[PDB]
UniProtKB/Swiss-Prot annotation:
InterPro entries: Annexin, Annexin_repeat, Annexin_repeat_CS, Annexin_sf, ANX8. Annexin repeats lie at residues 5-76, 77-148, 161-233, 237-308. Ca(2+) binds at residues 250, 252, 254, 294. PANTHER family: ANNEXIN (PTHR10502), ANNEXIN A8-RELATED (PTHR10502:SF133). Keywords: Annexin, Blood coagulation, Calcium, Calcium/phospholipid-binding, Hemostasis, Metal-binding, Repeat. A pair of annexin repeats may form one binding site for calcium and phospholipid. This is Annexin A8. It comes from the Eukaryota. Pfam families: Annexin.
Length: 311
């Protein structure tokens, strides 16, 4: 699709869709959900050159509700999008700790470096400093650690002696009776590579006769538990993590639309095809069927256009 692209006609379609009295929402869906993010940026530039207004600001004014949130989300470049989500998680009343955990645990070091740069450019403060001020306790420690390198950019070579020592230390940390040693869990889970951690989880099972997930579930609670389990799930299979995130955004009463939007939008050009496959395998139904059950209107139709064919 990106073999060679003139954005001008698409910009004109959007102009006609919003100009005057009445809004053609379907024409907005047909352009923005069928073009790539980079093509959208070209469309935005053409729109401003031709018509003198910023496309995103125009979209924010012309549209409302969930449909507006989704369409505007599509207009953010990668990394800047996550920076906006993280800012929104902290700037309001309360902290949306779940948003922060998801992004920090599921992104790679190099992705996080880009998100950190975008966050400082757009909001004039350091992401790490804002997290330090807005969170506390052990949650604060793991989140800061995930940003503070927490690298791997790995090999396939794991040090077997260190993997065994890490597993021994995790076991010992769980076994202390007047307070789990949370810092030992945090350091190993946040500073070791994914490949090393997979071996640690294997060794931990042999030593402890308990899965690492069940140990975390019995030894921790609340946000710290969520954060640890998220690191574990992302290490084992990232695509499966995102499927589960989407499932729980929709399961039961109501919808966590913020979570649905963010995960579909941010994964749309990376692994949404694998997420769809994993969703089917894990839950015995398609992603689209749950979206159809939980959402309505132009919002629903835009989500389904993005997801694409889902037999
Ligand atoms: Ca629901």
């Amino acid at each position: 699709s990106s073999s060679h692209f003139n954005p001008d006609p698409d910009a004109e379609t959007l102009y006609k869709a919003m100009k005057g009295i009445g809004t053609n929402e379907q024409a907005i869906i047909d352009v923005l959900t069928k073009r790539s993010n980079t093509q959208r940026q070209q469309i935005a530039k053409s729109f401003k050159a031709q018509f003198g207004k910023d496309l995103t600001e125009t979209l924010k004014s012309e549209l409302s509700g969930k449909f507006e949130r989704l369409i505007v989300a599509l207009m953010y470049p990668p990394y800047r999008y996550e920076a906006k989500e993280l800012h929104d998680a902290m700037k309001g009343l309360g902290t949306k700790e779940g948003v922060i955990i998801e992004i920090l645990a599921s992104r790679t070091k190099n992705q996080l470096r880009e998100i950190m740069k975008a966050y400082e450019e757009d909001y004039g403060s350091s992401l790490e400093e804002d997290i330090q001020a807005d969170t506390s306790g052990y949650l604060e420690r793991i989140l800061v650690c995930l940003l503070q390198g927490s690298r791997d950019d790995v090999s396939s070579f794991v040090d077997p002696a260190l993997a065994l020592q890490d597993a021994q230390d995790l076991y010992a940390a769980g076994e202390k009776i007047r307070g789990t040693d949370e810092m030992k869990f945090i350091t190993i889970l946040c500073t070791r590579s994914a490949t090393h951690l997979l071996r640690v989880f294997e060794e931990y099972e042999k030593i402890a006769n308990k899965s690492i997930e069940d140990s975390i579930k019995s030894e921790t609670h609340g946000s710290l538990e969520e954060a640890m389990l998220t690191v574990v799930k992302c290490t084992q299979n990232l695509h499966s993590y995102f499927a589960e995130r989407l499932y729980y955004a929709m399961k039961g009463a109501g919808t966590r639309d913020g979570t649905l939007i963010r995960n579909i939008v941010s994964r749309s050009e990376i692994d949404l095809n694998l997420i769809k496959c994993h969703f089917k395998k894990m839950y015995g139904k398609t992603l689209s069927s749950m979206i159809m059950e939980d959402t309505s209107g132009d919002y629903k139709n835009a989500l389904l256009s993005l997801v694409g064919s889902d037999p």
